[PDB]
Amino acid sequence: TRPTVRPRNDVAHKQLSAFGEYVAEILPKYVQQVQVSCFSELEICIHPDGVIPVLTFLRDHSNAQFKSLADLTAVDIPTRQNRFEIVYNLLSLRFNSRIRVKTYTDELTPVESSVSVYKAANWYEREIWDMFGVFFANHPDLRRILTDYGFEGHPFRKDFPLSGYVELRYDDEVKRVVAEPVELAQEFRKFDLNSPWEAFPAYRQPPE
Amino acid sequence: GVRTSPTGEKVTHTGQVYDDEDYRRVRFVGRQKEVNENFAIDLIAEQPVSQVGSRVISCDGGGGALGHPRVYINLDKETKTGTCGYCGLQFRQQH
Amino acid sequence: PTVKPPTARKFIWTNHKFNLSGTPQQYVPYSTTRKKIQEWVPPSTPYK
Amino acid sequence: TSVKPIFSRDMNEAKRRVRELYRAWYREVPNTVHLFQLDISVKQGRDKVREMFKKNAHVTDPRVVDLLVIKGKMELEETINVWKQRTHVMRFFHETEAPRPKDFLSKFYVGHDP
Amino acid sequence: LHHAVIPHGKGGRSSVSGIVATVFGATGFLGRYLVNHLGRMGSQVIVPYRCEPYDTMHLRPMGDLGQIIFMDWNGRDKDSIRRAVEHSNVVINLVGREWETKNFDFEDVFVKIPQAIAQVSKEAGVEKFIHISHLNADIKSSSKYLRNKAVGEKEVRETFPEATIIKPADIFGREDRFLNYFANIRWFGGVPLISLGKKTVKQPVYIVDVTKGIINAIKDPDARGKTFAFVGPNRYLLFDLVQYVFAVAHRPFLPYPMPHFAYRWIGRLFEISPFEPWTTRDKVERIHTTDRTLPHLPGLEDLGVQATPLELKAIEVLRRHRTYRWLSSEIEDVQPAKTV
Amino acid sequence: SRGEYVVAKLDDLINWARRSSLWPMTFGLACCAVEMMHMAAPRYDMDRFGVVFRASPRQSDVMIVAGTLTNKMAPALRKVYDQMPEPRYVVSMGSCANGGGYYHYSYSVVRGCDRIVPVDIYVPGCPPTAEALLYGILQLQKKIKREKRLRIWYRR
Amino acid sequence: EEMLTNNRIWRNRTVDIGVVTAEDALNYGFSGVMLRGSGIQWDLRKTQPYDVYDQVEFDVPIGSRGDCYDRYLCRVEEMRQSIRIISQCLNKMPPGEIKVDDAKVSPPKRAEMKTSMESLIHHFKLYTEGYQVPPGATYTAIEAPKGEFGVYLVSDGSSRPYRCKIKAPGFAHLAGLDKMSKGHMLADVVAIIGTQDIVFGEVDR
Amino acid sequence: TQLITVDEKLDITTLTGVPEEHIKTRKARIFVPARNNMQSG
Amino acid sequence: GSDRSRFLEGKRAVEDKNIGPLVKTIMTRCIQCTRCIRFASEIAGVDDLGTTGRGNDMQVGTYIEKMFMSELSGNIIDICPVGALTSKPYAFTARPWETRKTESIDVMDAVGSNIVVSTRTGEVMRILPRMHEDINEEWISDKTRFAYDGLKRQRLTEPMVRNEKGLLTHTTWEDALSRVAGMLQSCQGNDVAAIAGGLVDAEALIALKDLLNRVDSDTLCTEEVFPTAGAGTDLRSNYLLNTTIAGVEEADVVLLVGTNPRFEAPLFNARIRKSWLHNDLKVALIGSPVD
Amino acid sequence: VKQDMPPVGGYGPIDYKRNLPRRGLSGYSMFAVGIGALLFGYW
Amino acid sequence: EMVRKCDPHIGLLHRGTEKLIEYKTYLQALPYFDRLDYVSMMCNEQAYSLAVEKLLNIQPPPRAQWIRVLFGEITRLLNHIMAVTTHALDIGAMTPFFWMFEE
Amino acid sequence: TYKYVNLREPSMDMKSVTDRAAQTLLWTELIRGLGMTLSYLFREPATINYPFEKGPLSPRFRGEHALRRYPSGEERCIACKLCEAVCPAQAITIEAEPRADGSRRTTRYDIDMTKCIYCGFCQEACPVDAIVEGPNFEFSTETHEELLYNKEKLLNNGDKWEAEIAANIQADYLYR
Numbered sequence A: 001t002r003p004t005v006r007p008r009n010d011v012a013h014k015q016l017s018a019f020g021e022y023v024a025e026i027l028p029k030y031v032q033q034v035q036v037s038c039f040s041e042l043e044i045c046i047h048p049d050g051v052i053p054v055l056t057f058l059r060d061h062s063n064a065q066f067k068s069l070a071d072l073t074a075v076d077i078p079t080r081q082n083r084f085e086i087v088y089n090l091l092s093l094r095f096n097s098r099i100r101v102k103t104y105t106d107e108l109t110p111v112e113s114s115v116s117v118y119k120a121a122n123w124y125e126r127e128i129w130d131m132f133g134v135f136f137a138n139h140p141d142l143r144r145i146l147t148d149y150g151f152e153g154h155p156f157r158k159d160f161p162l163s164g165y166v167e168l169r170y171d172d173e174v175k176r177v178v179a180e181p182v183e184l185a186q187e188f189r190k191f192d193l194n195s196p197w198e199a200f201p202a203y204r205q206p207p208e
Numbered sequence B: 001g002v003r004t005s006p007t008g009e010k011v012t013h014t015g016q017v018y019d020d021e022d023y024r025r026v027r028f029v030g031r032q033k034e035v036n037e038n039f040a041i042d043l044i045a046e047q048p049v050s051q052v053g054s055r056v057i058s059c060d061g062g063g064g065a066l067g068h069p070r071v072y073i074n075l076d077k078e079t080k081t082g083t084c085g086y087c088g089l090q091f092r093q094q095h
Numbered sequence C: 001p002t003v004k005p006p007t008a009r010k011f012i013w014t015n016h017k018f019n020l021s022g023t024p025q026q027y028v029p030y031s032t033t034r035k036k037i038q039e040w041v042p043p044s045t046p047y048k
Numbered sequence D: 001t002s003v004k005p006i007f008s009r010d011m012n013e014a015k016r017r018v019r020e021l022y023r024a025w026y027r028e029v030p031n032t033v034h035l036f037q038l039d040i041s042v043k044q045g046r047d048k049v050r051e052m053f054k055k056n057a058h059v060t061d062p063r064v065v066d067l068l069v070i071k072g073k074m075e076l077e078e079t080i081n082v083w084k085q086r087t088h089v090m091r092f093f094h095e096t097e098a099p100r101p102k103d104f105l106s107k108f109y110v111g112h113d114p
Numbered sequence E: 001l002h003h004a005v006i007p008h009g010k011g012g013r014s015s016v017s018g019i020v021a022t023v024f025g026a027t028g029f030l031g032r033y034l035v036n037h038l039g040r041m042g043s044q045v046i047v048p049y050r051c052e053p054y055d056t057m058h059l060r061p062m063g064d065l066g067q068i069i070f071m072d073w074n075g076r077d078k079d080s081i082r083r084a085v086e087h088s089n090v091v092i093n094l095v096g097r098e099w100e101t102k103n104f105d106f107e108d109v110f111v112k113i114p115q116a117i118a119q120v121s122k123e124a125g126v127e128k129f130i131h132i133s134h135l136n137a138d139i140k141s142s143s144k145y146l147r148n149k150a151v152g153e154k155e156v157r158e159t160f161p162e163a164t165i166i167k168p169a170d171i172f173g174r175e176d177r178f179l180n181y182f183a184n185i186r187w188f189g190g191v192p193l194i195s196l197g198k199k200t201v202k203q204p205v206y207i208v209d210v211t212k213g214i215i216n217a218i219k220d221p222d223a224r225g226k227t228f229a230f231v232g233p234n235r236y237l238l239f240d241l242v243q244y245v246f247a248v249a250h251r252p253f254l255p256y257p258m259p260h261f262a263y264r265w266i267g268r269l270f271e272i273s274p275f276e277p278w279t280t281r282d283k284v285e286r287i288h289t290t291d292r293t294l295p296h297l298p299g300l301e302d303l304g305v306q307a308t309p310l311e312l313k314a315i316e317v318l319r320r321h322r323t324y325r326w327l328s329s330e331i332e333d334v335q336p337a338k339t340v
Numbered sequence F: 001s002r003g004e005y006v007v008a009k010l011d012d013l014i015n016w017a018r019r020s021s022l023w024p025m026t027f028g029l030a031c032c033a034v035e036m037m038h039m040a041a042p043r044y045d046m047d048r049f050g051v052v053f054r055a056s057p058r059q060s061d062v063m064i065v066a067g068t069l070t071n072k073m074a075p076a077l078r079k080v081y082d083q084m085p086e087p088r089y090v091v092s093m094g095s096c097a098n099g100g101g102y103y104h105y106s107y108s109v110v111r112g113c114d115r116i117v118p119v120d121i122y123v124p125g126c127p128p129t130a131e132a133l134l135y136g137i138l139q140l141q142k143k144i145k146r147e148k149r150l151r152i153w154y155r156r
Numbered sequence G: 001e002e003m004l005t006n007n008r009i010w011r012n013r014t015v016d017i018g019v020v021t022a023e024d025a026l027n028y029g030f031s032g033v034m035l036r037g038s039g040i041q042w043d044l045r046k047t048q049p050y051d052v053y054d055q056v057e058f059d060v061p062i063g064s065r066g067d068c069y070d071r072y073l074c075r076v077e078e079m080r081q082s083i084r085i086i087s088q089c090l091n092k093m094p095p096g097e098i099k100v101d102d103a104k105v106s107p108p109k110r111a112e113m114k115t116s117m118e119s120l121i122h123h124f125k126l127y128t129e130g131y132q133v134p135p136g137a138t139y140t141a142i143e144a145p146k147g148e149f150g151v152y153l154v155s156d157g158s159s160r161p162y163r164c165k166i167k168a169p170g171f172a173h174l175a176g177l178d179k180m181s182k183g184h185m186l187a188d189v190v191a192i193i194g195t196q197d198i199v200f201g202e203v204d205r
Numbered sequence H: 001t002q003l004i005t006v007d008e009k010l011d012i013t014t015l016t017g018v019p020e021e022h023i024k025t026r027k028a029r030i031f032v033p034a035r036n037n038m039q040s041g
Numbered sequence I: 001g002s003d004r005s006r007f008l009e010g011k012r013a014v015e016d017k018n019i020g021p022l023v024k025t026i027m028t029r030c031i032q033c034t035r036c037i038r039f040a041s042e043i044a045g046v047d048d049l050g051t052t053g054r055g056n057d058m059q060v061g062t063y064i065e066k067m068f069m070s071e072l073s074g075n076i077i078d079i080c081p082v083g084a085l086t087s088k089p090y091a092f093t094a095r096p097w098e099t100r101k102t103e104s105i106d107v108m109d110a111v112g113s114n115i116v117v118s119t120r121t122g123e124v125m126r127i128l129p130r131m132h133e134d135i136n137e138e139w140i141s142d143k144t145r146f147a148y149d150g151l152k153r154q155r156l157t158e159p160m161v162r163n164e165k166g167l168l169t170h171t172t173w174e175d176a177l178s179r180v181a182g183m184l185q186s187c188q189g190n191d192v193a194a195i196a197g198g199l200v201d202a203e204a205l206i207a208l209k210d211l212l213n214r215v216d217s218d219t220l221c222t223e224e225v226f227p228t229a230g231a232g233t234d235l236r237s238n239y240l241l242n243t244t245i246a247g248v249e250e251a252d253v254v255l256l257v258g259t260n261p262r263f264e265a266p267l268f269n270a271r272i273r274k275s276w277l278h279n280d281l282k283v284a285l286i287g288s289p290v291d
Numbered sequence J: 001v002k003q004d005m006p007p008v009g010g011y012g013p014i015d016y017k018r019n020l021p022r023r024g025l026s027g028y029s030m031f032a033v034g035i036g037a038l039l040f041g042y043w
Numbered sequence K: 001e002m003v004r005k006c007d008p009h010i011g012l013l014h015r016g017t018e019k020l021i022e023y024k025t026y027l028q029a030l031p032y033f034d035r036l037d038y039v040s041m042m043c044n045e046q047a048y049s050l051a052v053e054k055l056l057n058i059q060p061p062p063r064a065q066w067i068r069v070l071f072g073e074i075t076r077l078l079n080h081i082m083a084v085t086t087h088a089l090d091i092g093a094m095t096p097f098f099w100m101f102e103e
Numbered sequence L: 001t002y003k004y005v006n007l008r009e010p011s012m013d014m015k016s017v018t019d020r021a022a023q024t025l026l027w028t029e030l031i032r033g034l035g036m037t038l039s040y041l042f043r044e045p046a047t048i049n050y051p052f053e054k055g056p057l058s059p060r061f062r063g064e065h066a067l068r069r070y071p072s073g074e075e076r077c078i079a080c081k082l083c084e085a086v087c088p089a090q091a092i093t094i095e096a097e098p099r100a101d102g103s104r105r106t107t108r109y110d111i112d113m114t115k116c117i118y119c120g121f122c123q124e125a126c127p128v129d130a131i132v133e134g135p136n137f138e139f140s141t142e143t144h145e146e147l148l149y150n151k152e153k154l155l156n157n158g159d160k161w162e163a164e165i166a167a168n169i170q171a172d173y174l175y176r
């Protein structure tokens, strides 16, 4: 198990288990699960009405001090009923660690914006409106940030296909770059690469 | 062994040539259909059948790690040569 | 290649042609396969 | 079925925001035709805003029309400020597409599309 | 019917439309918009180009990969014409010069070259030939343009009997020689007119309607041997037409009559040039030739094409020729002209 | 003839003056801007050929589309090309500007800059090396050298 | 450093220009130089050490005022320390292999693919299907020379990533541009676009 | 209260931006993907 | 398994066999698992595949130049887990990761075999079975598996009308449908009819039935003559396989009257043989003594 | 084996420091040269 | 010419990297990271490599890690040369641009 | 383990204050910059004479693609489609069939050079070294479809450049 196996850090594993016990008993209103991953990174799974109360704890409390909002992420999972999963990544410089505050919403239910806690989210959740369609109420300037101006739909949703529904071309009749229904030169060749033998026995789900 | 179709156009080694009424010859009007005249089947028909004194022969295309992976060929039929799958070489037991 | 020449093959061009683009010797792409669906040829005699 | 609203409690405030958004577009369209110096008139632009509002006029869910008011106000916010261009405004006006045949016999003739 | 020329797709840019069109003179006014409206369907278009290749470069963003084949040709050579039309299932003639040059008169552009292309299109198996005449092209007309064009039309009709011959009246576009011409006589003086420009009646037609008519003539097999006549929906006098152009362009308009005998002497003052001449007496005799009405010939409404009137697209043509002080005046901020 | 000889010498003259003083414009988009900078570096050095940057479109001969043309910057590229005075040329640099490249199937990439602008030289690479970009500029010079402007002008 | 650090024209374009306080730098998600210009002692190669950055010896330049000039000096001194680490790694380079020898993860060598059978199956299946990654979400962050470059990679258990969020430094830095250009002219906003090393491929993804 | 009671059909067909052409003219198929007979897994 | 080789030797090479124009056979790649032999012995019921030799030289084959042609001779392509028995028409043309697996239905026989038509770049590559417990358990016949290239030859691609000399010339859809409807409107009553062929779905059949009922014609026929005497086609009980295909698993006496179910409904004969092998099905045939 | 390795005695030491060499005269000497230039010009 | 409000519209180079990553394998997902920070190429290679190796519960050999650090610091020289010299270009010292691009 | 950039409190004796006042008035660092620029004036600049000289490369270099052949004429591409399963741009289109002598060969090997990212997963995934990414980088075009290489153009690149590609693989195959 020496040469080609990543060495295990039981110390950060145990410390993130203890800090997860700490946070789960400080906040029983919104913290729903606490899990320490096998490579020693903590995930605090909360309720979507707890964006402001939890993250203000972690930004301010003298045992957490998660000062920097590093990354903010939605992960569209279509097989749920709350299909979007907003992932907060928090870096604490004083205690030198990272925490992962995961929560959920579907399309129509809004998530309360956390620019009152972390100003760094001023763009990040803005991207989640542009890419996914998760609306963030009580945001300073919420709009698209990355796609085209006359762009209909949200790209990183998995019902939205790889190539969109509009392509562009210059048109010399109207002297204008116009959007037309997409006709590809080559179809995107989809590869069914899922090998039907069970790869990982430690990740087997129980049957019906 | 390249030949010319009755539309005046050279045939590829696949068998591709446009017919008489096909409009897609117009992309070669004033230009040239770039084909290769060193056909693979013609340049491997020239190679001799290698007489070897073993029942099972090992072919690797020559060069060691510069050719195809090394496969083993059975040579029991005196009717049929033992053709390598990758390189097109073919062997025969000499008895 | 006048001290250590490259190894000669029976198919390597001894006539190196330069970038022929824009000239009538240039390259034009095309499909290299054959016709997939073979159409039906109707008969040459009437049905009477 | 007891969910959290966005802005409106039921369809009264929802129709209020749809109505104020259309008021904003009807006030705005002559400025859009002027500063983008389009070759269309104000009448054709207001016909297009009418068509865009009647395209989505079958919704009965208050959260869905709340988000539609939000997306319409984002379109308004990017139209009033010059953040869109002439192409982004004229992409509503499908001028360059071939007109799609609607009846059955022409769709039978031109392809396999149902 | 070959398998590759069967139409496919949604009729977009990368569709297959089943049209193989050789558009002679596709570098000019009608050819630009015709390759535009063919390349958005997916047609293997042959562009035979006479000019500099650079002047054809703007025809490359108008289609998919390899749908436009550019090739050389010469007007006095049936070899390159046969080389270009022998794989096309439709040939379209857009060869024209509104003035005469040293190497080619009106006859070599309108009699020799169209009959040459039509004869070679007959002897190469082409399904449809299309010739573009002018609505006032008659044997008994005053300008050598219209006489040579009617002679060449009669030749094309007697050498290719299924040729679709189309009559546009006076086409206007962004690159025309009709409205830009009428807006380029604020340079010379006060836009002089023969007999005040009140005795001639016109009806101009917009180039998108003419291009839709040409393509709906290619698609429909009811166009074999016909003789269409593309006209605008509203007739105009010349005087209030020029006054409408100078009111859309928002210019000082002070007209004055230059007589019938001394305005051709100004017409010879500009055709002494080896350049593209600014005006000539042929353009004078064509502007002061009224558009005939041909009720017995079909038009845009006999191809399913709704004609667009002048008041929608004259602003599109004439927004260029404005100064800054009325650069962004709206379309409704002008008075419509008086139809007759 | 004699006038044909005069306009042939004048074609050689003005095509020489247009090819030996190509002015590209500072138009980078993506990773190919780095290699376009290295084509302006001391080692490969466009300016030894007479090839110098001018940032305005009004005073440039060629526009090297160095990088990815997305769906949000199609009208900016088109208006930048259209504000260039004639003669204007386009050297499509890199795979995303040529044919979409590595982001060809993606929703927000114009699949080739030949859809938006006319393209005179295609320089393949991801990125094409600054030596190969320099070879593309030299092939553009070999395209300008065989222009026939006043010959076709005299023969029309 | 001779051309720019002592030059008065450079100091007059960089001393007052774009000052970032400490708590606002932690607040806006700044990372790397944008923190280290503001006096924040944070370098991800010393704090959360990865591959062998615990076995090299180098210094971390810390700014004093947070302007363009201190971040300039931070970048110059990081080039100095990069020469230091390259000298150490050219002296401390061990012998060994270059891929991980687990052949289900890394492809095999070509001489052992064209002779053996298991390595041919693994070459075939690593270049056609690829290796299966266990299901789970990770956030791996490094100190790119701009700042924290991070990948939040969520894997479903197949050979294709389910989601790959790319935390880039220039995104948060160009966010903080809105505060940093308060009370300057046009000719200083170009220096602020400079001192935040904004490469827009990572801003726009 | 701070909660609304919606008894309507859940309909985001106008928010996803997908055109009508590929909402009513497509037949979606929900299926357990059948096993490839070359393999036993 | 592991990830490298300790086999520092020279491998064996086994002679290839010749068992037909369907199954390309390269016996070097075999692992001697014997799914060949248990398949051809229990389900195909041929007893002409076997194991010759002994030790590491044990060649799985026929021992003679015998062409293994059963009604289910292609399914040894399916169950062989190695590439020792590949399809010979499908050979070299495709590769499974790029194939789109469209789940479809056999129409070659009235068994109703669930299949997968796997395609590539808009072209049918091959046809495999699906696992359906009551029809085609995970097998198909050889006609179903290898009748995909007749699907892509001799295809009617364009409307063809009679010209002035009675030849079939190509034409548009407008002209062909107009010249059909011109004779359709001049027919009324029993002046127009129809013959329903072999491969025609219920959508087309009810389409043409509604079209010939707008003309009020009931002369709508099929190729295969079913006797209408007695109840005829009214009750569904006397023109079906009323029990199930699965019910042959339950039965004990199956009487076959006037049919040859090996070649007409081949996987139904496979179900009769599996009930014969396991559930001891007692079979009787009235007709010619077929195999 | 035959692999890319550093030599057995290592490499030479690589300088990585600031070296701004402090050239130029003093301040008083530069003002002396300047005032001497002014006085010679004035004379 | 005093600055009151800056609003950076971005997304003019948005190509959808992290949607194309979801449809390709891991070895195929690596060359997107060359093209995100295209003056910090092997840094982003190293970051994605550490991400996948963290998920795989495997570690590189020692020589691979020292080569990663060697070329990561060469990459650090590359990115800081780009940063410093184009910042001096945007301010106006266009000369150390040309002096450092031979390096 | 850290250092403070720009934390130099300057000297405040009359000597150094007079030195900095003369540095401000008499422009000392400006003359330092002028001296450094004049010192790079008098060098040999690194401008190489392209196209009569060429840039330095290495045998790992990845340029225009090519299909190689055995030293008996038979082509190497045995139609096994790994190079389209690993191609990150999906720039390769392969269709195959058994030819006359029964050997597994291609009938369509398209590489779209304007999709290709020139990363060489095809030349390292090929189990027979059939597809290689050669040394040619001076293969620029003037028309877009000229960069859509089919099987014929790639065989022509292989036969044209085999005298160089075989030597590069001969010099490089011990590192892979």
Ligand SMILES: CCCCCCCCCCCCCCCCCC(=O)OC[C@H](COP(=O)([O-])OCC[N+](C)(C)C)OC(=O)CCCCCCCCCCCCCCCCC
Pocket: G008, J031, J035, L024, L025, L026, L027, L030, L031
């Ligand atoms: C005509 C022939 C050639 C002329 C010389 C050509 C070579 C020199 C040019 C070098 C390159 C310059 C390029 C542009 C530089 C732009 C920057 C610049 O100039 O900044 C100006 C700088 C500005 O300095 P600063 O902006 O750094 O000032 C510091 C200000 N604080 C502290 C607020 C930051 O210097 C000057 O303004 C100097 C003015 C002229 C000095 C003349 C001194 C006369 C001394 C008389 C005697 C004094 C002793 C006491 C009295 C005795 C009486 C007898």
Ligand SMILES: NC(=O)C1=CN([C@@H]2O[C@H](COP(=O)(O)OP(=O)(O)OC[C@H]3O[C@@H](n4cnc5c(N)ncnc54)[C@H](OP(=O)(O)O)[C@@H]3O)[C@@H](O)[C@H]2O)C=CC1
Pocket: E024, E025, E026, E027, E028, E029, E030, E031, E049, E050, E051, E074, E075, E093, E094, E095, E096, E097, E098, E104, E108, E109, E132, E133, E134, E168, E169, E170, E171, E172, E176, E177, E178, F156
């Ligand atoms: N106002 C109008 O435009 C109207 C025009 N028409 C008719 O429509 C047709 C096309 O008109 P339009 O597009 O406006 O004219 P253009 O001047 O814009 O284009 C005519 C084309 O013909 C080519 N051509 C002309 N003479 C020759 C020659 N001797 N040899 C080779 N090529 C030649 C030109 O080639 P090159 O680019 O090399 O010069 C050019 O491409 C003409 O028949 C005209 O009479 C009818 C009604 C109105």
Ligand SMILES: C=C(C)[C@H]1Cc2c(ccc3c2O[C@@H]2COc4cc(OC)c(OC)cc4[C@@H]2C3=O)O1
Pocket: F026, F027, F028, F029, F030, F033, F034, F036, F037, F040, F053, F067, G199, G200, K039, K082, K086
């Ligand atoms: C003038 C010379 C000698 C060089 C510098 C230069 C070019 C050509 C183009 C550009 C450029 O620099 C500016 C500023 O720096 C970057 C840096 C970039 O990325 C790091 C980048 O990416 C799109 C774009 C740019 C500009 C750009 O378009 O030639």
Ligand code: SF4
Pocket: F030, F031, F032, F033, F066, F067, F068, F093, F094, F095, F096, F097, F101, F102, F125, F126, F127, F128, K035, K038
């Ligand atoms: S063609 Fe490729 S390497 Fe080049 S700029 Fe585009 S993404 Fe970057």
Ligand code: SF4
Pocket: I030, I031, I032, I033, I034, I035, I036, I037, I060, I079, I080, I081, I082, I084, I085
């Ligand atoms: S089924 Fe395949 S592996 Fe098994 S004995 Fe037959 S050929 Fe060999």
Ligand code: SF4
Pocket: I029, I081, I082, I083, I084
């Ligand atoms: S794919 Fe399977 S049957 Fe074919 S050679 Fe490899 S291990 Fe043997």
Ligand code: SF4
Pocket: L083, L086, L087, L088, L089, L090, L091, L092, L111, L115, L116, L117, L118, L119, L120, L121, L122, L123, L133
């Ligand atoms: S080098 Fe080009 S053809 Fe080869 S795998 Fe990479 S992108 Fe595909």
Ligand code: SF4
Pocket: L076, L077, L078, L079, L080, L081, L082, L083, L084, L094, L125, L126, L127, L128, L129, L130, L131
């Ligand atoms: S080029 Fe190589 S990897 Fe690609 S199909 Fe041919 S032999 Fe296989």
Ligand SMILES: [K+]
Pocket: I076, I077, I078, I079, I080, I081, I082, I083, I084, I085, I086
């Ligand atoms: K098999």
Ligand SMILES: [Zn+2]
Pocket: B059, B060, B061, B068, B084, B085, B086, B087, B088, B089
């Ligand atoms: Zn061999």
